[PDB]
């Protein structure tokens, strides 16, 4: 276990989360955005 940076469910609204050497990145599902994939555009 080295670095999944996805510990502690960080993204919101079923936002997926990849990995990186400095903070992961959030991927909002179609219809969400915001710093956390928080916001439902609709
Ligand atoms: O990653």
Curated annotation (Swiss-Prot):
Residues 2-38 form the EGF-like domain. It comes from the Eukaryota. The modification (3R)-3-hydroxyaspartate is found at residue 19. Disulfide bonds join 6-17, 11-26, 28-37. Transmembrane segments: none annotated. This is Factor X light chain. The gene is F10. The chain holds residues 85 to 126 of 492 of the full protein.
